[model samples]
Target: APPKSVIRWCTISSPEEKKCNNLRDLTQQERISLTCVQKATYLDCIKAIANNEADAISLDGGQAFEAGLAPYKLKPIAAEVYEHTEGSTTSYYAVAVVKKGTEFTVNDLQGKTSCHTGLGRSAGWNIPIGTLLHRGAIEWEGIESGSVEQAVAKFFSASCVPGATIEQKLCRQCKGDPKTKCARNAPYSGYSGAFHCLKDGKGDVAFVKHTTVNENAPDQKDEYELLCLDGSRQPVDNYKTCNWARVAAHAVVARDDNKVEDIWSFLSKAQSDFGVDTKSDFHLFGPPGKKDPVLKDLLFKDSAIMLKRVPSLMDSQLYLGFEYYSAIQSMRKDQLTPSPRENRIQWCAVGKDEKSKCDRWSVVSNGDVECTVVDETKDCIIKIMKGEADAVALDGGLVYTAGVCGLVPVMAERYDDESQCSKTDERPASYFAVAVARKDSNVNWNNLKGKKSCHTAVGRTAGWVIPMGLIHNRTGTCNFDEYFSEGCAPGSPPNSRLCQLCQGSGGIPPEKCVASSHEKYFGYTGALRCLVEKGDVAFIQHSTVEENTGGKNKADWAKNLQMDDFELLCTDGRRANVMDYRECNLAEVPTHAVVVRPEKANKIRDLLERQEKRFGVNGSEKSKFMMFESQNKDLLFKDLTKCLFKVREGTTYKEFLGDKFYTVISSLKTCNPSDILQMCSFLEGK
Candidate 1:
């Protein structure tokens, strides 16, 4: 009563083939048939599975992502689970292990002999190599001449990286020629194989999973140590504390459309009969050999506790997370580029002030930086999307728009709050958007209709978008000009009521009101100036009042003003002192962020951090020149910014801004596709 169908499991080595044969025998009693299909490497297995030459294979996260790509639409059917002190999870640590007395760290790894499980495996190659590149310990220029395998070969004095025999240098340290001895089928292939290279004195360091040293040399655990990022060494077993990265365990992948249920049924029955708990002579999860266990792990990770079913919708990228996926992709591209120095970033500036500041930044950076000037945030973002500009700082609202256009936030501006002046390093990452009004004004949140208002710009996050959205939601109408008796929202129509409160340049016509920053009342400082002399209230960022008044600023309109003369309108219909904005703000907005194309995100982040440290508000070169102190308004960066810190690698605007705020912004967005409707359309499926 054998099953009608047979499952052909891909095997990468002789031990794996033998294990597959054993599974076939054990599963026969349960009316299930398993068959062994030989593949030379993980890449071969992926191609075989795609062509239906093989039904399934177990793969590391890196290989799994490749298998999920185009031409082969394979998906993970199950994941190997491993138990740790915390709990059982399908993740493991990628560690770099060396002899205890090596007196070397990750920084000393250059020109050293290295050992790896295989070329494309996660723990063995991708994670460690990716980490090294991200740390900038190695440059892309050194690897441009050859493939990753060849690059690694040149980086090290010698190496035993199985499945990397495409180049002769890659096989120099390998035992024999690639045709027979350098393949994954060779004696030194997987975790135990890489460990043997180190233990036998064939290599100086071994890149493998955290458990390799402990499981292979149980008594010699103290003789091995892990190379940490801080250039310090830790005990071999302390991978959770000192490892390159935490990567997902090997996954059991199969054809997404066919034999899914049949494959699972066979795996379940085989594990039950010959798994770790089985009493039979044949052990499915046992080590490959008794003493050295040259092929200790076969078909699956030896330490795998169980195979958990993968959800139907879980693709490799989704399973690996954006950070890991991007790292692997970046490493692949790095090997192809001829030079890293030629990739200088082009920073986009939205206005004349921004362009001027960017010019100063470029000069101070010794041409390491470049500038691209645009008239509006939309134009700047479009240039980035079209690959004309590499990076720019944007407000939260534009950040959301940019995200939809496939741009990513690299770093966010952090301001030095006077409230926390003593703790310079602990500045808040976000700022508050508030309604600023003179303390003597009769305006309250409830009865502000028909009052003159001043705004930075029509679509700016703090000045117009957030405040107008709130008003629209509260008043149940979009006729903002009618609700506000008059206002000067720069970028608004020149003849509209929205521009009625504007004060044009002394000699310029009314057309000046339509220009950004050109009108007398245009930006954050301009709006505040409007409140001081022309308008009743100003919608601006919380620090605007403090930054301009009380001698902090020496501008004509602000020199006579006092911080005590301004108050914030609370959302709950009360006015509070300007210093109490945290309790009275209209909205807590995300800070301005430097955004870039995903490919250039890491470089831009690194460059900005370095530049800011040299020319920022509190930088070492502050005495020579100030990057933030603008003659007009906030320019390339916010004038109040204390520092810039990187955002998480794959953060989205919605994730950066809270869900409630994102929802409000979404609801208030107009139907015009020119502004954000296209972005909305792009994000529809996402």
Candidate 2:
């Protein structure tokens, strides 16, 4: 049973208001009566939709993200698709345009007059400002905190950023009065307005969409150019190559519980009757009449070719992509304030010992760095997300979790080849997660059903996650407890069989299942020790046995042990020498990386580079002091780390850990999303 033909579409009032009325009348003849709800502003229209006063409204990507958040709960129903010369796409480029021969790059925009479409708009504000912030070209002082428009007003000498005109400096170059001209309703308040501001010589540069200059000043195309991050200028038309970022096209959104089907049906018929291809004077997808030329791209973009249905679960962030979403999130931060430790990077450490080591590293740097300690690795990541801590080195599995929680991997620990003590960038390298068992046990991968096992920790990559994930996939079940007879996986529930083999520190029961080396059988070395005395098999990193047991090292636990006493269990049902991990390893995982919030990623990376040059393995201070060394296995950084190298911009967790490894790790992530992880997944449209 279909609902009756009733659809209420919302629009901001302007010349487009009349066109909307005309379309309503046209839909009436088709048995569908359309109600046009005119609102004073875009946010007003979104509010109307949320209250069920209107069925749908077209919004820019930034606005769409807001609507998708609490209270509104709106989901995109249709996307405005655009046609490009090469093909068609549901995205457009955000570019910075300037008069030719401006002799300034994006880096030179300081103290210059600027023009933006409006506050909160994707191209004109978020993209440009976020890009500059990442590059460390702009600072946030002297601006109103938490207000993007105020920040822009302070960043530029004079500007014409529409909306929020309380800041006189921002409105100084605006052409009209506050009510009629400075308002978003004014002609100089959008893509067209920003371009006009630059065209009329009122602004040194304009942040707008790529097609804006071509649409407004088609004849003088050669007079405009795009500013690039690389400090070079390119022709305006080459925006695909020189733009700040590519963002999703505007979309029409509706309340998820509303009459979405009816609205889609009505829009389909309305567009068919008077869409761009038709020869009607009244167009459903056309710009407002020339008589009101000031109102450009009203209701729908002038360049939109058609409306495409948005998927049911597609939210604003997923539609916009993580990179653009991150940019918008950065622009919404409170004004940057000066702190006593403004130049120092706060590195997160996992335990008391690691914190103490990190403190020494900080002292060596003369307070250019500091340390924040958390009891666990996951908690350390949470601090980074909340801005309590700046950065931490994370394993591949945790790196994926961090990325899903809106953190970026900035640098990877590079270890030297021969001594495994020096760092080198000449060859990017990774270690393997391997299965180890005593040679005399005659245990191989295929006969491990009832064998007692030891693991580094429950969530660690080399220790537990990778090995257990592979067994789970092979056995075709999520209940891993049914396969292994007993094990010591630190961090598992205390009563579970997974903790049956653990020997608590000093025989204390309460400390038995802890996820740190505080437990006698935790971490790579601890797990290997567990296999040496209590367990039949152990899952750990490739170098665990060699680094701890060989004659090269002589700790009490390893003084009588030899690396030759162990062998690796290969998946192919065979065994090989422990050092033959190159051919018998479980999975080659990406190196540990320093993860941070994307906004602070660049700065943290820069500070670490400088610090490493001073205290790294090959630094001048290496002979006197080693920053990466620890009396324990690995503390602030891996002992073998030669150096740290920057990760490519916009690289996600899935990208850094190759597809094969990422897929396996994802399959093993069985926990229900936490509140923080849930919000991240929601933003990513999971």
Candidate 3:
């Protein structure tokens, strides 16, 4: 075996020892070729990966994920996840800092010159630029129209830096190097780059990565405060808006034709033989762990182990990802779980602040809420079920399909009588936020299983939930709870009743016991009903719900929920939310009519009658009120469907159907086509 050669890697210093330690434990023969390269740029490694010039690159996750590597050509070797517990902080994002007392936000530096390394280079530019674009800040046009360096120079020159050092340097347009001109001169004022125009004095804000800031002015930490989106200088509180340090995944990539197998194999075994720490090379990066637990265990074992691996060639070549993926699993039904704080309800949402009265109730009432502000609500709810939140507020359908779950609807926005709302003589665009598909569009929900689904917040009911639930009903099954959870893990922990849904398949929907929450059948209720009603949805799920208000079997309907349709879909008795309305709302009076949103009219009538019978509240006025009047007091009758009908001009139908009968009439509209005549007869018969 050749004598083990250890290389000192120094894109970043310090963690270099961890890499050396990793190599020390390796077999002499395996570790023989270790070498370290200092002052290496991630850009240099990218070119190597693209050209097959290097076997692997040791960098961060942000760089690797952004390298455009084909999944087949490069796979991340399992690496340890870093929690940022100690040591100098890793440079993960770009930040804009204003001299103390200067109020600045991204908007404040819009046309300002900010200083950082040149663009296209990984550290100084691409990552920050990509993040800015992702957040809908600066458009690509702004960056492309002028060179990044030039732009920064202009901002800095015109900025509000009070005692800024007036270093005379050659301007791109200036005649001499180290060009000297008055501070007021347009050409020589402020930081200058090759392409950007200049302004006098410094900019409103100065932007730079943590490393660059630390290097350029190591002792001025207190003189400048980092700027964030919400106009704060604290990096920890307002990280999303910070634009200085760019978090990138550094990974190895090769051609898509399977030419990198040998390289990958070498890397797979290289970590154990030679440890690597890609941290600080770029912001955080890494790969899946279970498969390479031993390698991860060894790489993160001691302070020195991580240091040696920090600069390993293997670290650079492997694609590492650094973003958070929060997924929680649920449990099987018939399995009972203990609830120590039964009265405390836990919930989570996507924003840091509670925006409405309902959200405030959800938080203050439970005292156990964890607002995750994630783009997805299903994920939020999953967090709730996984003991992350004691309870979560999500669409009714997502709760059911993920597993058998319970829900207590917290009222948010409601479409009440149109007469009460602001009226406009001008017609507006379509208000029905449907999940539509073009005939030739290749996109299909079934094709996107386990893929990310984006939509508005979970609180927006009809705009989001109703339609999603409908699609899940059309599909055989869905893992909504698992999908909602941050990670895709399945089967909740041992003592979680919410996790045991599968075992409750045959049991009654648990009305009072902990065991009932997990019953699989109980969860599908809301989602199934939505499909049968052809509800609208803002996001696509397993199935698609059309926007129609006529009875399920109306003449022009493509797929309506008739007895035949249910039988064809094998969904009779499978949908619980569609059951008798009287039972659902616990009503008493026998209603002459039960109104509902037009699309749900038929189903509502059926449910009302069924509930009336089950609860034995057949002719009681209280039952009637709860079944129709009370539940739909705030119901609105806006025309979501384009199916137009003539009504008296200037006379609002909302007023015509007063609150007392709004729900009664709405329920009537949802009557099944086969039952339409029966409904009309009942209305006229009453």
Question: What does the lDDT read for residue 446 in candidate 2?
Answer: 82
Model 1 TM-score is 0.50
Q: Top lDDT: which candidate number?
A: 2
Q: How many residue pairs clash in each candidate?
A: 0, 6, 114
Superposing all C-alpha atoms, what RMSD in Å does each candidate have to the true structure? Answer: 12.0, 8.7, 22.8
Model 1 misplaced regions, further than 4 Å? 1-103, 120-154, 164-181, 191-205, 208-339, 342-366, 370-434, 437-443, 446-454, 459-488, 492-521, 524-537, 540-567, 571-574, 577-686
Better of 1 and 3 by TM-score: 1
Candidate 3 lDDT tens digits, 453-558:
3332222333233433444444334443333212111133444322332233344543321223343212223222332333221132222232122253253433
Collision pairs in model 2: 145-335, 146-334, 146-335, 422-642, 423-642, 423-643
Looking at model 1, residue 426 earns an lDDT score of 53
True-structure RMSD for candidate 1: 12.0
What is candidate 1's CA lDDT for residue 676? 37
Give the Cα-based TM-score of candidate 2 against the true structure: 0.62
lDDT of candidate 3? Answer: 0.31
